[PDB]
Design an enzyme around this catalytic site. Structure first.
Site, short mmCIF file in Angstrom:
data_model
loop_
_atom_site.label_atom_id
_atom_site.label_comp_id
_atom_site.label_asym_id
_atom_site.label_seq_id
_atom_site.Cartn_x
_atom_site.Cartn_y
_atom_site.Cartn_z
N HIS D 61 0.83 -1.21 0.00
CA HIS D 61 0.00 0.00 0.00
C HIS D 61 0.87 1.26 0.00
CE1 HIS D 61 -2.86 3.10 1.40
NE2 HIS D 61 -2.19 3.18 2.55
N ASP D 91 11.36 22.20 -24.41
CA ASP D 91 11.19 20.86 -23.84
C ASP D 91 12.03 20.83 -22.59
OD1 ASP D 91 11.23 17.69 -23.59
OD2 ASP D 91 9.78 18.21 -25.16
N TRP D 126 7.00 -0.31 4.94
CA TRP D 126 7.67 0.33 3.80
C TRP D 126 9.07 0.81 4.17
CZ3 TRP D 126 8.86 5.61 2.21
CH2 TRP D 126 8.70 6.56 3.25
N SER D 156 15.21 6.26 -11.53
CA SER D 156 14.24 7.05 -12.28
C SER D 156 14.16 8.48 -11.74
CB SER D 156 12.86 6.37 -12.18
OG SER D 156 11.91 7.27 -12.76
N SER D 157 14.06 8.62 -10.43
CA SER D 157 13.86 9.94 -9.83
C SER D 157 15.14 10.74 -9.73
CB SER D 157 13.25 9.85 -8.43
OG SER D 157 11.86 9.53 -8.52
N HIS D 240 12.84 11.30 5.73
CA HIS D 240 12.22 12.59 6.03
C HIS D 240 12.24 13.52 4.83
CE1 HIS D 240 9.99 15.50 8.00
NE2 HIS D 240 10.66 16.27 7.15
N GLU D 242 12.02 12.68 1.90
CA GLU D 242 10.99 12.12 1.05
C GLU D 242 9.59 12.71 1.35
OE1 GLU D 242 8.72 9.75 -1.66
OE2 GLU D 242 10.80 10.45 -1.65
N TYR D 244 8.90 15.66 2.44
CA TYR D 244 8.87 17.01 1.83
C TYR D 244 8.84 16.95 0.31
CZ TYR D 244 9.10 18.06 6.59
OH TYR D 244 8.71 18.12 7.91
N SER D 255 -0.46 26.92 -4.52
CA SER D 255 -0.23 28.34 -4.81
C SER D 255 -0.85 28.77 -6.14
CB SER D 255 1.27 28.64 -4.82
OG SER D 255 1.77 28.55 -3.48
N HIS D 290 13.70 12.12 14.45
CA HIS D 290 12.40 12.08 15.09
C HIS D 290 11.59 10.85 14.67
CE1 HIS D 290 10.85 14.86 11.59
NE2 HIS D 290 10.47 13.61 11.31
N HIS D 291 12.13 10.07 13.72
CA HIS D 291 11.58 8.75 13.42
C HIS D 291 12.14 7.68 14.32
CE1 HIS D 291 9.36 10.17 9.98
NE2 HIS D 291 10.38 11.01 9.81
N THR D 316 6.44 26.90 7.25
CA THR D 316 5.21 26.33 6.73
C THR D 316 4.04 27.24 7.06
OG1 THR D 316 6.16 24.16 7.13
CG2 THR D 316 3.85 24.25 6.52
N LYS D 319 3.60 29.90 4.58
CA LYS D 319 2.88 29.51 3.37
C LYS D 319 1.37 29.46 3.60
CE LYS D 319 4.76 26.93 0.25
NZ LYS D 319 5.14 28.17 -0.55
N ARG D 438 0.58 0.38 15.48
CA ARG D 438 0.64 0.23 14.03
C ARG D 438 0.90 -1.20 13.63
NH1 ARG D 438 4.51 4.77 11.41
NH2 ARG D 438 4.01 3.55 9.51
#
Ligand SMILES: CCCCCCCCCCCCCCCCCC(=O)OCC(COC(=O)CCCCCCCCCCCCCCCCC)OC(=O)CCCCCCCCCCCCCCCCC
Ligand code: HEA
Ligand SMILES: CCCCC/C=C\C/C=C\C/C=C\C/C=C\CCCC(=O)O[C@H](COC(=O)CCCCCCCCCCCCCCCCC)COP(=O)(O)OCCN
Ligand SMILES: CCCCCC/C=C\CCCCCCCCCC(=O)O[C@H](COC(=O)CCCCCCCCCCCCCCC)COP(=O)(O)OC[C@@H](O)CO
Ligand SMILES: CCCCCCCCCCO[C@@H]1O[C@H](CO)[C@@H](O[C@H]2O[C@H](CO)[C@@H](O)[C@H](O)[C@H]2O)[C@H](O)[C@H]1O
Ligand code: CUA
Ligand SMILES: [Cu+2]
Ligand SMILES: [Mg+2]
Ligand code: NA
Ligand SMILES: [Zn+2]
EC number: 7.1.1.9
Lengths: 43, 49, 58, 514, 73, 46, 84, 259, 144, 105, 94, 79, 227
Positions: D61, D91, D126, D156-157, D240, D242, D244, D255, D290-291, D316, D319, D438
């Site tokens: 998932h 392009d 995950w 890829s990324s 972390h 990731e 963001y 925006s 913090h994880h 944040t 924003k 969890r």
């Protein structure tokens, strides 16, 4: 935004068909698997 | 000229709400779902030991 | 060696509509077909191997 | 012609279209997995099996929703379609490498499907922590197929990040500085920098896991002097950043959407918005532990990570308040995309605030590895990243396709989804505070009421997903062709018509320096 | 017969904003007071009241007599 | 060159809305069904 | 230090060739001498079956599963000790 | 017809063949690790090399032979290569983190010391020092090659580039010998793990960088480079300096400090 | 009149209350009588009739402000249809309960729950606020 | 940063330019309605007379509509502005939107 | 120490790279590498916007340091004005 | 000599959540002390404090494995 | 334990858990206020026909938007960190107990004096005694003396687990090769329940923790009888 009227209008009946087909495409295969879970579990 | 919402909005609103309430009330009360509410004020405690 | 870049420039600028990966001539097509055949055949083979590995074997 | 165009593409719009189609298909896979989770939990007892089959479902998932739905849609789909148009470029910088970033994803997804079909699947989370993910507790090919799936998605990324950074730095009109590019372009550039720096560290960590599983290394195995906790650091040093990466393009789309349906020519506080995204990106590299507040780290380290994490609320909040200030005084157009964006502002704020609760390491002792974390991150992912995706999809669908959606249907869809996601996740706060862990396939009886409600909410979201498919069908079925779009003077991506020609900006824009 | 007075014509949006942000603040304060009374202080008093005269041995003896313990009959 | 315009810049045809419905049904339906059949696969193993 | 060379006036190929042949390759030659003065077997230590070494949690995917990829019988014992 | 300076690339099959090569290499590694078979892997390695060959071949056709590398295009490629190197730095950073994590807090299983009980490290003053002088020297010779090219000197560019390549090959052969001679292995706990995985990925990058220099050598033989336009050479030189700097960090960290 | 796709790069008409004077007139082509009306507009507007003034307005603009700003009954359709589909979801949940879910565990039987409730009170689960705090141990009943 | 009176005077001067062209009329009105204010009658008067010099009756009516729109829920502003403009409306023969039926939905 | 044998760009550049090189020598910019410098932008002295067709998109940075760019099609014919600042632009096709 | 042992006291050398080295160090100390005593002609009773501390802190299986490796000659710490 | 329809934390059993409740109340008040303020301002921005669409100067207001949240963050961090360092403060335990996680059960070792250790497994649902709690009871509870500072040391002999007791504010990961320390002090006798809190495989859901808190004298006799 502005737009042209539909080139190929989709009537209420046609929408009911497209909606029904779409929903059945998701529901029938999952429903079949979930209905038969016990068949799978004990095998 | 009247549009779909002028013609049908009242019926859609009334029928949708009636249907939604009826079927959720049926689901919530008539088919054996166990909600497990608090026993507070509801359960008479019974000897267990 | 002598500088034959001008010759290669003429060949790869020829107005023949070919995409750059084929514009060297017949050898490009052969190497392309070999590559794509190995890739697509290998991909089918990998799917077969998935199929095999998806079930227990005695 | 079909193969040349759709398998051999060097065109940023067509490749963006491929990514949108791929992400939509992945979204169906991810939805089905989410429904299996909530079916298992929708009444007390066991539905499917023990925690192994359950957590293969949970693990897949997450991977599907993150790597195959959100990132391909936001970066590969909206990024490829919109970034070159928004800077007038013809392009991407590397238009052929761009096509390989796309075509690595179907094989990546195939590897993930393979992992779930062979042996008993990768039931790891995950995060793929060892030793559960190691070769004794997860013997066989499933975890290695997962690792290789991540390797391909990562390549890829990384190549995509290289492409976007280069395109955005190098291919603007010569008069346009970086402070004259739209906020969505900024959001993609910053996301790309985060991807560039973070994914190689994940690649290192999962490669070490691969060699511990197959080459008898012991990076994470105490018997060799390794440490399971080293894996967690390497993973979260990526993980972390990731999150963001998952939200920043969403911020960029929000925006644009809020500006557009407010009738404004510009967002409020443009340079503050740039500052805030850059600040969030920077801070997003110095908070990862913090994880790990329950792994046994020293107290001063816990104090630092609490404090640094809380700082993120400041940019944040700029924003959020700037979005509100963009609405302020607007001629509000209550379009479906506007509804998605308004839902975003509020529900993202709720989720960000429960993130600030979790940043407190003392409280996180009791909240960690409970459903309070699950509630938090689905507010920012199911009601933040996804609401931005839906808002962007409804807003730009007429640009990409040339056809309009039915707005009444799209508002119905929004309404159903809004009820469904909130019914799904709001009660999970109570389950977390009261201690439900969890990654459980079943729960002590006291937890039944909120699990029942949460599962009912998940079925409402299913109905919204099915209706979305019908709505896209109806648009292509009816073929209402776009005529006029307002505000093109401040939304360049619309100025070449709907859809734009295959080649745009063959003659570049004229922008003088003055 | 009668003419209309000149009304305020400028800054109407800003005026509206100022008035309601000020009202939001006042309500925020009102809420913080309500929450301290109805939640935070309530909890402190419940815990202080509970432990003020609490007899842990008496509690234990009640539990023991009810049969709940493995180690104490 | 390539076809341009609405309905032409996509790898699937929209010339017939009912053929399109079939294709969309197979496309999204196959994604949604796949996890259910993988679960069935794993249940039927052991 | 900061070395002790000199130079500049306008950078060039001639200076970098000078550095290649006058400093870089002489250094390689010196280290090659040094290295080959200290080569040849050193005695292999007593074998001790330490549990943090010679790890085997899964057979290697080559050979008999028990030999590392660049196994040297002279200096790399197996989990059971040196080979005959 | 365009009036910008950027490159509209012909539609190309190599992205797809490259993506499929990745599928075949990874499912091939899975087949090798778990099903005792190298077949898929060999196919994937072959299609990967074919893809790289034709793709970079085409970039040479597009630039040297067709003229598409305007200054704007070259500038993009400069950014692309720099960003690629940055991602590779971060990849190695993960392995350095692993190394420092394990060596700075040696666990009881190691003897609670570093190097672990029973590990006899290589002498950093023997072949490792030699390897250091070899890669440093090659950084000098590639700089000579670069200046020769800019000054229009074909013969000395070729000489300097050949010397650079020879040194890269010397390093690789020395490292292969050290691997064979090492009394510890990759299975010798976290010492062997960090040592071989980190120096092993570095050695792979030395081979990649050497191959890239060899490509440049043959392109130079064929007169592709002008005295002002030679980005493939610049990129190979940047990559080579990256490989040299990673070695210096490995030498100081793992071979010297970690001994 | 008729707006065409191939016109996307030309100045266009829009009715928007914050852009009151659009970039083009709503009607560009004039009939003979409409041409005569635009000539008459060059003389005193007091000599235009009400109908002529309305016709001049509708040449320049498509919808008036009152027309462009009108409210609609759309909300009824939206809310009503949303409730329909939410109601449809309960049908799915009914189906799931009937055909997918088996019996829940025996610990939810009324007598089990009554005994378990007593045992929770005997171990004083949540005795400060949450649970046993709500039980009157002296009167042996739930606090009122 | 400039008084109310200086602002209004700049805008009166803008619309009073004798040879103001159609583009400048539209630019002026479309810019003006972006501000947080309903324009003073003296501004609207100058804009309406610009409409007259440009032989554009329809834009004069539209300008009156946008005055009503900018007042929002403050229903007293528009009848006041019309009151103040009645001499100009009579002089120029400008009918209000209400007189033309253009306030009907 | 120092023979030759390396081609120059003058000798060997080709295609678009060569076109850009030769035009830059003549001080010309047919491939839009440089930012055009603005005129005063009055109706008398409009910014002259080259094009190989009969319309081109203009982006107007109305004031120095504006982050908002104003975009519009400029068509062959009478000069047009930026809708935000009014500065004039005229297309010079061919 | 100053008994009444209840459990291992706070030790400023090991003030953090990870107590692995505390267990390890006291295990080594006890066995080092015992080796010194059994040899030179003293009593292992002077080693007792380390014995009590490592027995309090160390998981049974760790002590058992370490004991086995000492017997085997594969204990990697220095005693 | 949790009770049906519970909204918040389990009642505190230790002083630190009570501290956490008051700190959560403080932080949740702020969360509610900020969320409600954002929702309200959204509705305020959306409920007027008045407009102002020209450029708005941002410099002034961003001072408020950064300084006020910074102040609020400091007002959260101060009590947060106070509790953190209170948790860490030296207390001198009277007793050390080890727990080792396993797939799928916990073992316990009390080796300050005698070699006492045992395994603790979930009671299967079919074997619950009437009134016992599904998925929460164990066969052998972790008997401990009440009103005493206890050192718990946590590890694992296989994969990760995590040892949690929400009533007492405890969660410590169980990591093979690592000995993690936490302190436990119950203000009351009774039964306090927790559940494995790191995914650990097939029966992660089914390896719970039950502490049984009793007077020292009962703990001593229980200990002796468990040898
Ligand atoms: C915020 C998400 C939007 C949708 C929300 C849907 C949820 C519906 C509420 C619609 C309104 C939701 C507002 C929050 C309700 C808090 C309920 C509560 O008693 O929470 C209590 C605490 C624990 O407290 C205690 O230890 C003492 C408990 C004392 C209990 C006495 C009996 C109380 C009544 C019991 C029945 C309640 C059942 C609720 C059942 C709810 C099921 C869905 O739990 C918690 O921390 C929960 C943590 C929540 C953190 C997110 C904050 C979001 C705030 C939104 C602000 C704008 C308003 C939205 C206004 C609506 C905006 C559209
Ligand atoms: C889109 C994805 C996303 C985003 C953007 C975020 C944003 C944040 N997250 Fe969340 N998070 C996740 C997705 C995300 N998170 C996921 C997936 C996990 C679990 C991983 C796993 O274990 O699987 C998780 C887990 C997680 C944890 C670990 C908890 C645990 O496992 O025990 C923490 C801890 O600090 C955290 C905190 C935060 C914070 C502080 C932010 C901040 O960025 C939020 C900032 C926003 C605001 C604060 C709101 C707007 C601000 C204002 C209106 C200003 C005024 C506010 C104040 C003064 C407070 N997150
Ligand atoms: C100068 C030498 C250069 C190295 C060439 C050797 C082949 C390796 C190819 C790739 C090297 C990259 C690192 C791979 C990891 C391990 C190899 C480490 C270097 C090496 O070669 O290590 C050797 C072991 O190799 C082994 O296990 C296994 C070797 C065979 C398996 C190869 C690796 C398989 C896994 C590859 C995973 C790749 C993941 C890539 C992700 C990239 C980012 C997406 C050490 O030999 P030894 O006998 O243990 O000790 C010497 C005792 N006399
Ligand atoms: C098995 C797995 C490993 C296999 C790896 C094998 C070896 C690959 C070695 C790399 C070879 C790269 C050759 C590139 C040749 C094409 C080239 O160099 O192209 C140049 C452009 O640069 C460009 O694209 C620059 C292109 C950048 C190439 C980057 C190469 C490094 C990346 C390799 C992959 C690393 C993977 C690491 C994984 C751990 C062409 O422009 P110029 O040179 O200016 O010429 C034009 C003038 O002639 C005009 O006058
Ligand atoms: C979370 C995603 C899923 C949500 C819920 C899905 C809702 C179900 C839709 C209907 O699904 C069908 O239901 C039938 C039962 O109503 C099943 O027929 C089964 O039952 C019939 C009646 O008992 C027999 O006639 C059939 O042969 C037998 O296959 C059938 O296979 C299944 O496709
Ligand atoms: Cu043990 Cu989860
Ligand atoms: Cu995080
Ligand atoms: Mg955890
Ligand atoms: Na279940
Ligand atoms: Zn301008």
């Amino acid at each position: 935004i502005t737009a042209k009227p539909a080139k190929t209008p989709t009537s209420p009946k046609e929408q009911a068909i497209g909606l029904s087909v779409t929903f059945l495409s998701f529901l029938l295969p999952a429903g079949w698997v979930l209905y038969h879970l016990d068949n799978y579990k004990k095998s | 000229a009247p549009d779909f919402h002028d013609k049908y909005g009242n019926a859609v609103l009334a029928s949708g709400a009636t249907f939604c309430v009826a079927v959720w009330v049926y689901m919530a009360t008539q088919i054996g779902i166990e909600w497990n509410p608090s026993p507070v004020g509801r359960v008479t405690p019974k000897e267990w030991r | 060696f002598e500088n034959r870049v001008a010759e290669k420039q003429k060949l790869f600028q020829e107005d023949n509509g070919l995409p750059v990966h084929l514009k060297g001539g017949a050898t490009d097509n052969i190497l392309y077909r070999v590559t794509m055949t190995l890739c697509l055949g290998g991909t089918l083979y990998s799917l077969y191997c998935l199929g095999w590995a998806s079930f227990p074997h005695k | 012609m079909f193969i040349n165009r759709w398998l051999f593409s060097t065109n940023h719009k067509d490749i963006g279209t491929l990514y949108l189609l791929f992400g939509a298909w992945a979204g169906m896979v991810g939805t089905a997995l989410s429904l299996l989770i909530r079916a298992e939990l929708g009444q007390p007892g066991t539905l499917l099996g023990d925690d192994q089959i359950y957590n293969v479902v949970v693990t897949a998932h997450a991977f599907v929703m993150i790597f195959f739905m959100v990132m391909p849609i936001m970066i590969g789909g909206f990024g490829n379609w919109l970034v070159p148009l928004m800077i007038g470029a013809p392009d991407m910088a590397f238009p052929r490498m761009n096509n390989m970033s796309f075509w690595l994803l179907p094989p990546s997804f195939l590897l993930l499907l393979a992992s779930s079909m062979v042996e008993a699947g990768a039931g790891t989370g995950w995060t793929v922590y060892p030793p559960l993910a190691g070769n004794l507790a997860h013997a066989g090919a499933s975890v290695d197929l997962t690792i290789f799936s991540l390797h391909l998605a990562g390549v890829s990324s990384i190549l995509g990040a290289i492409n976007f950074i280069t395109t955005i730095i190098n291919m603007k009109p010569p008069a346009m500085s970086q402070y004259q590019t739209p906020l969505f372009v900024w959001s993609v550039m910053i996301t790309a920098v985060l991807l560039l720096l973070s994914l190689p560290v994940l690649a290192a960590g999962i490669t070490m896991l691969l060699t511990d599983r197959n080459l008898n290394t012991t990076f994470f195995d105490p018997a060799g002097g390794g440490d399971p906790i080293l894996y967690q650091h390497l993973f979260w040093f990526f993980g972390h950043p990731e999150v963001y990466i998952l939200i920043l393009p969403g911020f960029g789309m929000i925006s644009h959407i809020v500006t557009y349906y407010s009738g404004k020519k510009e967002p409020f506080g443009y340079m503050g918005m740039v500052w805030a995204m850059m600040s969030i990106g920077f801070l997003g590299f110095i908070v990862w532990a913090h994880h790990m507040f329950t792994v046994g780290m020293d107290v001063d380290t816990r104090a630092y990570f609490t404090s640094a994490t809380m700082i993120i609320a400041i940019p944040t909040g700029v924003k959020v308040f700037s979005w509100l200030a963009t609405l302020h005084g607007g001629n509000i157009k209550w379009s479906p995309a506007m509804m998605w964006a308004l839902g975003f502002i509020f529900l993202f704020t709720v989720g960000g605030l429960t993130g600030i609760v979790l940043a407190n390491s003392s409280l996180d002792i009791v909240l960690h590895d409970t459903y309070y974390v699950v509630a938090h991150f689905h507010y920012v992912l199911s009601m933040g990243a996804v609401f931005a995706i839906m808002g962007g999809f409804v807003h730009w669908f007429p640009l990409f396709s040339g056809y309009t959606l039915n707005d009444t249907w799209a508002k119905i869809h929004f309404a159903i989804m809004f009820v469904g996601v909130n019914m799904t996740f709001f009660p999970q706060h109570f389950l977390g505070l009261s201690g439900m862990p969890r990654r459980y396939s079943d729960y002590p009886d006291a937890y039944t009421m909120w699990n029942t409600i949460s599962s009912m909410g998940s079925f409402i979201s299913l109905t919204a997903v099915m209706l979305m498919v019908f709505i896209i069908w109806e648009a292509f079925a009816s073929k209402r062709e776009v005529l006029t779009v307002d505000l093109t003077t401040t939304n360049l991506e619309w100025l070449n018509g709907c859809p734009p020609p295959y080649h745009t900006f063959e003659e570049p824009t004229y922008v003088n320096l003055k | 017969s009668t003419a209309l007075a000149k009304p305020q014509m400028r800054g109407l949006l800003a005026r509206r904003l100022r008035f309601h942000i000020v009202g939001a603040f006042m309500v925020s304060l009102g809420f913080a007071t309500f929450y301290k009374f109805a939640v935070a202080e309530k909890r402190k008093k419940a815990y202080a009241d509970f432990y003020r005269n609490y007899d842990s041995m008496k509690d234990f003896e009640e539990m023991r007599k009810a049969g709940i313990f493995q180690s104490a009959k | 060159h390539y076809e341009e315009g609405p309905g032409k810049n996509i790898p699937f045809s929209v010339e017939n809305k009912w053929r399109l419905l079939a294709m969309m049904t197979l496309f999204f339906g196959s994604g949604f069904a796949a996890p259910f059949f993988i679960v069935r696969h794993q249940l039927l193993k052991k | 230090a900061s070395a002790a060379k000199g130079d500049h006036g306008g950078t060039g190929a001639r200076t970098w060739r000078f550095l290649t042949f006058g400093l870089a390759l002489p250094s390689v030659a010196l280290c090659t001498l040094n290295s080959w003065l200290h080569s040849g077997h050193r005695e292999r230590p007593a074998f001790i079956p330490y549990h943090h070494l010679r790890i085997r949690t899964k057979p290697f995917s080559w050979g008999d599963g028990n030999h590392t990829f660049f196994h040297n019988p002279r200096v790399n014992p197996l989990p059971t000790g040196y080979e005959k | 017809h365009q009036t910008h300076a950027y490159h509209m690339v012909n539609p190309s099959p190599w992205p797809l063949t490259g993506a499929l090569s990745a599928l075949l290499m990874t499912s091939g590694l899975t087949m090798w690790f778990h099903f005792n078979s190298m077949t898929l892997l060999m196919i994937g390695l072959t299609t990967n090399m074919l893809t790289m060959y034709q793709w970079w071949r085409d970039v040479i056709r597009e630039s040297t032979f067709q003229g598409h590398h305007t200054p704007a295009v070259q500038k993009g490629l400069r950014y692309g290569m720099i960003l690629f190197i940055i991602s590779e730095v971060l990849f190695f950073t993960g392995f350095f983190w692993a190394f420092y994590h394990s060596s700075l807090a040696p666990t009881p299983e190691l003897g609670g010391c570093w190097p672990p009980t029973g590990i006899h490290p290589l002498n950093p003053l023997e072949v490792p020092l030699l390897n250091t002088s070899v890669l440093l020297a090659s950084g000098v010779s590639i700089t000579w090659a670069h200046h020769s090219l800019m000054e229009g000197d074909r013969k000395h560019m070729l000489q300097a580039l050949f010397i650079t390549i020879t040194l890269g090959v010397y390093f690789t052969l020395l490292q292969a010998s050290e691997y064979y001679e090492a009394p510890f292995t990759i299975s010798d706990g976290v010492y062997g793990s960090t040592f071989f995985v980190a120096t092993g990925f570095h050695g792979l990058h030395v081979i990649i960088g050497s191959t890239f220099l060899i490509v440049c050598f043959f392109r130079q033989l064929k007169f592709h480079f002008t005295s002002n336009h030679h980005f493939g050479f610049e990129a190979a030189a940047w990559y080579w300096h990256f490989v040299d700097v990673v070695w210096l960090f490995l030498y100081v960290s793992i071979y010297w400090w970690g001994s | 009149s008729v707006v065409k796709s191939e016109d996307y790069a030309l100045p266009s008409y829009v009715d928007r209350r914050d852009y009151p004077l659009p970039d083009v007139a709503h009607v560009k082509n004039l009939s003979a009588s409409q041409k005569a009306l635009k000539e008459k507009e060059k003389a005193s507007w007091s000599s235009l009739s009400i109908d002529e003034k309305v016709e001049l307005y509708r040449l320049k603009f498509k919808e008036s402000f009152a027309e462009m700003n009108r409210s609609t009954n759309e909300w009824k359709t939206v809310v009503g249809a949303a409730m329909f589909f939410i109601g449809f979801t309960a049908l799915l949940l009914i189906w799931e309960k009937h055909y997918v879910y088996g019996p829940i565990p025996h610990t939810f039987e009324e007598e089990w729950v009554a005994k378990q409730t007593k045992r929770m009170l005997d171990m004083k689960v949540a005795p400060i606020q949450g649970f046993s705090a709500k039980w009157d141990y002296d009167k042996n009943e739930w606090k009122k | 940063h400039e008084t109310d009176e200086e602002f209004d005077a700049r805008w009166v001067t803008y619309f009073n330019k004798p040879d103001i062209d159609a583009w400048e009329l539209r630019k002026g009105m479309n810019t003006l309605v972006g501000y947080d204010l309903v324009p003073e009658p003296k501004i609207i008067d100058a804009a309406l007379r610009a409409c007259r010099r440009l032989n554009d009756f329809a834009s004069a009516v539209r300008i009156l509509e946008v005055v009503k729109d900018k007042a929002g829920p403050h229903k007293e502003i528009y009848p006041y502005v019309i009151q103040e403009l009645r001499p100009t409306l009579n002089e120029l023969g400008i009918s209000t939107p209400e007189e033309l039926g253009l306030d009907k939905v | 120490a120092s023979g030759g044998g390396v081609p120059t760009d003058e000798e060997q550049a080709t295609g678009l790279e060569r076109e850009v090189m030769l035009a830059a020598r003549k001080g010309q910019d047919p491939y839009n590498i440089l930012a055009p410098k603005a005129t005063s932008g009055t109706k008398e002295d409009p910014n002259l916007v080259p094009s190989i067709t009969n319309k081109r998109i203009v982006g107007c940075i109305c004031e120095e340091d504006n982050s908002t760019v104003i975009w519009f099609w400029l068509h062959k014919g009478e000069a047009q004005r930026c809708p935000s600042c009014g500065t004039h632009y005229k297309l010079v096709p061919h | 000599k100053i008994k009444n042992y209840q459990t291992a006291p706070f030790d400023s050398r090991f003030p953090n959540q990870n107590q692995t080295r505390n267990c390890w160090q006291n295990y080594l100390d006890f066995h080092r002390c015992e080796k010194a005593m059994t040899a030179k002609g003293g009593d292992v009773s002077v080693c007792e404090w380390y014995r009590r501390v490592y027995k309090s802190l160390c998981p049974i299986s760790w002590v058992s494995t370490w004991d086995d490796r000492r017997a085997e000659g594969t204990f990697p710490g220095k005693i | 334990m949790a009770y049906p329809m519970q909204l918040g934390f389990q009642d505190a059993t230790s002083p630190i858990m009570e501290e956490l409740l008051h700190f959560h109340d403080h932080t949740l008040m702020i969360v509610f206020l900020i969320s409600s303020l954002v929702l309200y301002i959204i509705s305020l921005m959306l409920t007027t026909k008045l407009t102002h669409t020209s450029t708005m100067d941002a410099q002034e207001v961003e001072t408020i938007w950064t300084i006020l949240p910074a102040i609020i963050l400091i007002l959260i961090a101060l009590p947060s960190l106070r509790i953190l360092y209170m948790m860490d403060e030296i207390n001198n335990p009277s007793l050390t107990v080890k727990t080792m996680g396993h797939q799928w059960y916990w073992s316990y070792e009390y080796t300050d004096y005698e070699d006492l250790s045992f395994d603790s497994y979930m009671i299967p649902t079919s074997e619950l005694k009437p009134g016992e709690l599904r998925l929460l009871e164990v066969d052998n509870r972790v008997v401990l003396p009440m009103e005493m500072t206890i050192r718990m040391l946590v590890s694992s002999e296989d994969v990760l687990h995590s040892w949690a007791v929400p009533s007492l504010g405890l969660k410590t990961d169980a990591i093979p090769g690592r000995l993690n320390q936490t302190t436990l002090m119950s203000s009351r006798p009774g039964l306090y329940y927790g559940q494995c809190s790191e995914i650990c495989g097939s029966n992660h859901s089914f390896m719970p923790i039950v502490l049984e808190l009793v007077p020292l004298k009962y703990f001593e006799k229980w200990s002796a009888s468990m040898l």
